[PDB]
């Protein structure tokens, strides 16, 4: 069951964990082998997993798809995520999700090591990402909704980088560092 | 809101399955009536389950016909002996 | 492999015998044994295992029985069933139903009570 | 003796097909690749 | 064939051949998740006909 | 891939599908980029195009991809290197033809 | 010159059963008895005892299955086999192969578990 | 062919028991390290065998403490004479 | 190829003395005799075979050393140990380890006070051994 | 089998890899002990081996016979491949197969070192020759089919020298150099 849960968390929805385009990742049904309270807790973790899946979908939407060659590259950034800043945003998001992927693999290995471990151990171990991911998802959704383009995206990230969540602060600092690297590269080219 | 997704989805799926089963049974009953098969809901359900379980339709049909003939012979014997 | 708690073929056959005969399971034991023997026998493949061929055969048989309305109703019900996609073995159910169709005009040859004579 | 037995190392190989004894079980290569003796048996 | 069959049992199972290789696996819930899921499906929907599924090893996959 | 297969053959350590997918993740990303670039450079070229026209379309696609990956920065380094190698290889015959024309005065 | 100990047809059939079932000879005793009963039964002569006629029938059957390429391949392989002359009973082997051909288009009628009841 | 399966399985079980004992001893060593007990693997194994051999835990604890004090006194005597 | 088997106290004590003193058994004969005399008349019928008391004591000690994270790790380790069925006398092993435990803080280099409390444990003496 | 496979690649056909004068080296049949994907890999390797075998056959056909001192050397060129340039071509082909033979010997040493190696390692190691040999085989087949004679064969080699495969280009340069050495020897005698 843990392997299936991780696969859903790894982006492979199954018969237990159903993905809904509208609702995101959800537990598909009541399983006879789970206590309903255990089902409730698992779905509570599945909320974080759903956010992760939606983040991965966004990553594919903005970096995984070929940029339509609309002659005016400035407007490609509006409707579709496009622009070097958009690529930097996607790269930063993937870099921030890399530690989560590593933690998920470590959890899988640990659960493989000890058959007496329960899902509660994962819920403990994964709670840090259950707190981290929602804020970054909100920031990304704001970027998408405001159609931030070019360096104006950098300004928005800076404004969001001043958040109060220390882990969110560090993650946004990493993203801002990548964006500033892109900005500095452009500035280098100009100067 | 997080916890609710498994049981709620399970309930919605069960309701949809029940409605689909009802629709299928209605279609099957209409087909049986048009073909004058003489099958009732319980017998039709048993036949459907057997076919889903892989029973040969020719064997199943022969068995059903033989059982009906045996039931008619037994009813005739019971009516002649009564 | 999602095997619905399908009560054993023996239990299903017993339920079928009880329903058809209108008698309890205990009264159909000889008939149950006969059914088990019949079901266990190797049967030749059905004449048609194609849903569309079975539908066409059903339509032709209904037209031959002057049931053209029943043939159209059968074709429509078959289309609806195919679209519903609930049944896994449509060909088997269609073949069974076709094989079990009875012409209402041909007076059922009432199984003579005489078959009981050899049971003793 | 338990402590002499303690100095035994065991395989770290695990599988998600096994949970009751994850001491490894040697996937056992196949199609050539089991070496000369298996190839001779195949021949 | 007996020596060859013994090797064939010990040289990795013919599962890659259309002959069904049954392999022993742990029945633990975490290890028998496929079997437990099949059991739940079998328990949940009376219309569920079990499809023939080929069991493959994770290493084999 | 051969190194992964060797590690699988040794069977000494538990290798899971997730572990393999993660190991191939950089390679999988490079493969996705290469697939898109190849589709644009070759697959998008109409079959009836003249070999000169096919080549020019491929070359322009390569140049545009190069610009895109150079603007993508450090995260595309493996992809940028791949694209640079592709460009160098594709220009090798073209540069050779240019060299032959310049040196021998004969366009072969 | 001691022609390799081609074990008697009963032993060969037992080995074949063991291979097909994937069980030892001791585990197929009932199946061996069934095989002996089948083999001792009188079988009708094959419909066609002509190698070329059998090849043509195979090609026609493949065409009926919309396998025209497979029909051509079968005719070519049959010509090659006839020319090779290694097989003494070409007509019998062709009849066997025809009997063993399977239509890929016909969805396998999943043998109901009930067939096992008669296996005992 | 039948008989060979038992001895191989028994040997595998013994090896698994050994690995489990090793894991347990590792856990105990980790516990000692967190607790800064100062026991080495051989000493820990000897103590484990003694407790497993039925040594009275109050007696075992007192004996261990006395032995540790004696070992420390012997090490101090060896360092004073060196 | 060693199978776990009950070996006489003399062999175990000899090995223990050898490893503790780091000398041959001939060189620890006096110490061996003293230990043998003390150990030879000591059966603990008074020890309550209850792991929970030992675990609680260990937790309290860890808290005293400001090692709450280590206490959690110890709890998890105890859970794993219970999961494994290698040890039968866990109460004895835990009691021995706790008695032989040395505080890393005694981190630091000493421990604040030793106001032993009445808390303690059970006396088991109640049974007719 | 790996030794047997190399022997087939070394020109010793066996029961699995049969050499057919018409079909070349081929996998004899589907065996029950291999996955069909392994059968496909084996068939690709047998394709490479078939090409090698055909090259060796050509080498024997045009180089393997002692030169009959038929008084008229000019007529040898018509039916049979003949001429000093033909001998140089065969020598070049053998020299190009020499590095392939060396690589095969290295593969043999590796397989002797590790009995657990699979066909994938060979396919990796031998892929360079799997690319080299088909092009040279095509060139040789063109020479044979067009009955290129004398120094006119050199012109075809030049045409073949324009190939895109860098290794094929280098090999054809070596062959052309050997043929030019012979041509220069004749030219020296004349001049």
From Swiss-Prot, chains A, J:
Component of the gamma-tubulin ring complex (gTuRC) which mediates microtubule nucleation. The gTuRC regulates the minus-end nucleation of alpha-beta tubulin heterodimers that grow into microtubule protafilaments, a critical step in centrosome duplication and spindle formation. It is linked to Microcephaly and chorioretinopathy, autosomal recessive, 3: A disorder characterized by congenital microcephaly and chorioretinal dysplasia associated with poor vision and nystagmus. Variable ocular anomalies include microphthalmia, retinal folding, retinal detachment, optic nerve hypoplasia, absence of retinal vessels, round areas of chorioretinal atrophy, and attenuated electroretinogram. Most patients have mild developmental delay and mild learning difficulties. GO terms for biological process: cytoplasmic microtubule organization; meiotic cell cycle; microtubule nucleation; mitotic cell cycle; protein-containing complex assembly; spindle assembly. It comes from the Eukaryota. The gene is TUBGCP4. Keywords: Cytoplasm, Cytoskeleton, Intellectual disability, Microtubule, Primary microcephaly. It is found in: Cytoplasm, Cytoskeleton, Microtubule organizing center, Centrosome. One of its GO terms (cellular component) is membrane. This is Gamma-tubulin complex component 4. It comes from Homo sapiens. Ubiquitously expressed. Belongs to the TUBGCP family. GO terms for molecular function: gamma-tubulin binding; structural constituent of cytoskeleton. Transmembrane segments: none annotated.
UniProtKB/Swiss-Prot annotation, chains B, H:
GO terms for biological process: gamma-tubulin complex localization; microtubule nucleation by interphase microtubule organizing center; mitotic spindle assembly. The modification N-acetylalanine is found at residue 2. Its main location: cytoplasm. It is found in: Cytoplasm, Cytoskeleton, Microtubule organizing center, Centrosome; Cytoplasm, Cytoskeleton, Spindle. It holds the Pfam family MOZART1. One of its GO terms (cellular component) is interphase microtubule organizing center. The keyword Acetylation applies. Keywords: Acetylation, Cytoplasm, Cytoskeleton. Required for the recruitment and the assembly of the gamma-tubulin ring complex (gTuRC) at the centrosome. The gTuRC regulates the minus-end nucleation of alpha-beta tubulin heterodimers that grow into microtubule protafilaments, a critical step in centrosome duplication and spindle formation. Belongs to the MOZART1 family. Associates with the gamma-tubulin ring complex (gTuRC) consisting of TUBGCP2, TUBGCP3, TUBGCP4, TUBGCP5 and TUBGCP6 and gamma-tubulin TUBG1 or TUBG2; within the complex, interacts with TUBGCP3 and TUBGCP6 to form a luminal bridge with actin that stabilizes the initial structure during complex assembly. Interacts with TUBG1. This is Mitotic-spindle organizing protein 1. It comes from Homo sapiens. The lineage of its organism: Eukaryota, Metazoa, Chordata, Craniata, Vertebrata. The gene is MZT1.
Swiss-Prot record, chains C, G:
Ubiquitously expressed. It is found in: Cytoplasm, Cytoskeleton, Microtubule organizing center, Centrosome. Signal peptide: none annotated. Disulfide bonds: none annotated. It comes from the Eukaryota. The modification Phosphoserine is found at residue 113. Component of the gamma-tubulin ring complex (gTuRC) which mediates microtubule nucleation. The gTuRC regulates the minus-end nucleation of alpha-beta tubulin heterodimers that grow into microtubule protafilaments, a critical step in centrosome duplication and spindle formation. Component of the gamma-tubulin ring complex (gTuRC) consisting of TUBGCP2, TUBGCP3, TUBGCP4, TUBGCP5 and TUBGCP6 and gamma-tubulin TUBG1 or TUBG2. TUBGCP2, TUBGCP3, TUBGCP4, TUBGCP5 and TUBGCP6 assemble in a 5:5:2:1:1 stoichiometry; each is associated with a gamma-tubulin, thereby arranging 14 gamma-tubulins in a helical manner. Gamma-tubulin at the first position is blocked by TUBGCP3 at the last position, allowing 13 protafilaments to grow into a microtubule. This is Gamma-tubulin complex component 3. It comes from Homo sapiens. The lineage of its organism: Eukaryota, Metazoa, Chordata, Craniata, Vertebrata. The chain holds residues 1 to 120 of 907 of the full protein.
Curated annotation (Swiss-Prot), chain E:
It comes from the Eukaryota. It is found in: Cytoplasm, Cytoskeleton, Microtubule organizing center, Centrosome. Widely expressed, with highest levels in heart and skeletal muscle and moderate levels in brain. Component of the gamma-tubulin ring complex (gTuRC) which mediates microtubule nucleation. The gTuRC regulates the minus-end nucleation of alpha-beta tubulin heterodimers that grow into microtubule protafilaments, a critical step in centrosome duplication and spindle formation. Belongs to the TUBGCP family. Component of the gamma-tubulin ring complex (gTuRC) consisting of TUBGCP2, TUBGCP3, TUBGCP4, TUBGCP5 and TUBGCP6 and gamma-tubulin TUBG1 or TUBG2. TUBGCP2, TUBGCP3, TUBGCP4, TUBGCP5 and TUBGCP6 assemble in a 5:5:2:1:1 stoichiometry; each is associated with a gamma-tubulin, thereby arranging 14 gamma-tubulins in a helical manner. Gamma-tubulin at the first position is blocked by TUBGCP3 at the last position, allowing 13 protafilaments to grow into a microtubule. This is Gamma-tubulin complex component 5. It comes from Homo sapiens. The chain holds residues 210 to 270 of 1024 of the full protein.
């Amino acid at each position: 069951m843990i392997h299936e849960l991780l696969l859903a968390l790894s982006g492979y929805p199954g018969s237990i964990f159903t993905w809904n385009k509208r609702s995101g990742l959800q537990v598909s049904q009541d399983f006879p082998f789970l206590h309903p309270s255990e089902t409730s807790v698992l779905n509570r973790l599945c909320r974080l997993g759903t956010d992760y899946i939606r983040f991965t979908e966004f990553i594919e939407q903005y970096t995984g798809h070929v940029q339509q060659q609309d002659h005016h590259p400035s407007q490609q950034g509006q409707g579709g995520l496009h622009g070097i800043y958009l690529r930097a945003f996607c790269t930063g998001l993937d870099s921030v999700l890399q530690p989560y992927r590593q933690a998920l693999l470590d959890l899988e290995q640990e659960f493989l090591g000890d058959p007496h471990l329960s899902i509660s151990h994962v819920n403990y171990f994964l709670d840090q990402f259950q707190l981290l991911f929602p804020s970054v998802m909100v920031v990304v959704e704001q970027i998408k909704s405001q159609k931030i383009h070019g360096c104006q995206i950098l300004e928005t990230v800076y404004k969001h980088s001043c958040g109060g969540l220390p882990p969110v602060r560090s993650a946004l600092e990493k993203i801002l560092a990548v964006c500033h690297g892109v900005m500095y590269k452009q500035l280098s080219a100009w100067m | 809101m997080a916890s609710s997704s498994g049981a709620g989805a399970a309930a919605a799926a069960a309701a949809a399955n029940l409605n689909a089963v009802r629709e299928t049974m209605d279609v099957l009953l209409e087909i049986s009536r048009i073909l004058n098969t003489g099958l009732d809901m319980e017998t039709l359900s048993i036949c459907v389950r057997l076919c889903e379980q892989g029973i040969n339709p020719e064997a199943l049909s022969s068995v059903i016909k033989e059982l009906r003939k045996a039931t008619e012979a037994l009813k005739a014997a019971e009516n002649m002996t009564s | 492999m999602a095997t619905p708690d399908q009560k054993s073929p023996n239990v299903l056959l017993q339920n079928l015998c009880c329903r058809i005969l209108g008698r309890s399971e205990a009264d159909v034991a000889q008939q149950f044994q006969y059914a088990v023997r019949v079901i266990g026998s190797n049967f030749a493949p059905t004449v048609e295992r194609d849903e569309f061929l079975v539908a066409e055969k059903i339509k032709k048989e209904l037209i031959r029985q002057r049931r053209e309305a029943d043939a159209a109703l059968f074709s429509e019900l078959h289309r609806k069933l195919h679209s519903q996609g609930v049944l896994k073995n449509k060909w088997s159910i269609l073949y069974l139903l076709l094989s079990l169709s009875e012409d209402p005009r041909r007076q059922p040859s009432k199984v003579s009570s005489y078959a009981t004579l050899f049971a003793q | 003796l338990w402590e002499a037995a303690l100095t035994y190392e065991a395989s770290k190989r695990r599988c998600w097909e096994r949970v009751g004894c994850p001491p490894g079980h040697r996937e056992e290569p196949y199609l050539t690749e089991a070496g000369r003796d298996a190839f001779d048996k195949f021949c | 064939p007996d020596d060859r069959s013994w090797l064939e049992h010990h040289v990795v199972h013919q599962y890659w051949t259309a002959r069904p290789s049954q392999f022993p696996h742990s029945l633990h819930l975490h290890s028998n998740l496929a079997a437990v899921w099949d059991q739940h499906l079998y328990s949940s929907d009376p219309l569920y006909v079990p499809d023939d599924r080929v069991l493959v090893t994770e290493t084999q996959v | 891939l051969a190194e992964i297969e060797k590690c699988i053959i040794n069977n000494d350590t538990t290798i899971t599908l997730a572990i393999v997918v993660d190991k191939l993740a950089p390679r999988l990303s490079q493969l996705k980029v290469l697939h898109k670039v190849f589709s644009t450079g070759v697959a998008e070229v109409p079959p009836d195009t003249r070999n000169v026209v096919r080549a020019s379309h491929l070359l322009n696609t390569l140049y545009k991809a190069i610009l895109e990956y150079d603007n993508v920065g450090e995260a595309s380094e493996q992809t940028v290197s791949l694209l640079f190698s592709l460009w160098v290889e594709t220009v090798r015959p073209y540069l050779q033809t240019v060299d032959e024309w310049i040196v021998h005065g004969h366009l072969w």
